[PDB]
Design a binder for this molecule. Structure first.
Ligand SMILES: CNC(=O)[C@H](Cc1ccccc1)NC(=O)[C@@H](CC(=O)NO)CC(C)C
Ligand SMILES: [Ca+2]
Ligand SMILES: [Zn+2]
Ligand SMILES: [Zn+2]
Length: 157
């Protein structure tokens, strides 16, 4: 599954009160930048309307078939490209979201969920952003496995 268009939009529907709004926007815009730096994709943030990728902070049963589970456990989930909810990213509001090394760094999680929004599955490489359990090294960057995977779907910049 992949997006047919290379110019996509996203919208942050709501925000967690754990961080100032600017920090949430920054964390999300930098996560998209990681993926657009190695592919021909471009991302535009819209303030209203329906976007290709809708991001929201929600808790427990939130109208999809994957209810959240409170603090810890699953931290966020996303949907592969497609119509409707395809591409959407949901972050569990019951977690403590940070901008530093304390669990759990929003930018680090957003980088992994947007990989799913673009069509990636999980990696078996512990240094990869797409590994299935959270890791935080201090500096969020794509690993070779991450680069290889997204360029296999959209080509290289
Ligand atoms: C601290 N929680 C985790 O690391 C759990 C796995 C886990 C669950 C129970 C106990 C130990 C580990 N992983 C997730 O939340 C992932 C779910 C997911 O893949 N979304 O796309 C997202 C992270 C990789 C950012
Ligand atoms: Ca949780
Ligand atoms: Zn959800
Ligand atoms: Zn995942």
């Amino acid at each position: 599954p992949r997006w047919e268009q290379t110019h996509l939009t996203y919208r942050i529907e709501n925000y967690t009160p754990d961080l100032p709004r600017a920090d949430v926007d920054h964390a999300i815009e930098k996560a998209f930048q990681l993926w657009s730096n190695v592919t021909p994709l471009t991302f535009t943030k819209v303030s209203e309307g329906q976007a290709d990728i809708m991001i929201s902070f929600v808790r427990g049963d939130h109208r999809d078939n994957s209810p959240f589970d409170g603090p810890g456990g699953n931290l966020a989930h996303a949907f592969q490209p497609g119509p409707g909810i395809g591409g959407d990213a949901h972050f569990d509001e019951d977690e403590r979201w940070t901008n530093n090394f304390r669990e759990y760094n929003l930018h680090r999680v957003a980088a992994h969920e947007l990989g799913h929004s673009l069509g990636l599955s999980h990696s078996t490489d512990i240094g990869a952003l797409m590994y299935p359990s959270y890791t935080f090294s201090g500096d969020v960057q794509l690993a070779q496995d991450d680069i290889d995977g997204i360029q296999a779907i959209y080509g290289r910049s």
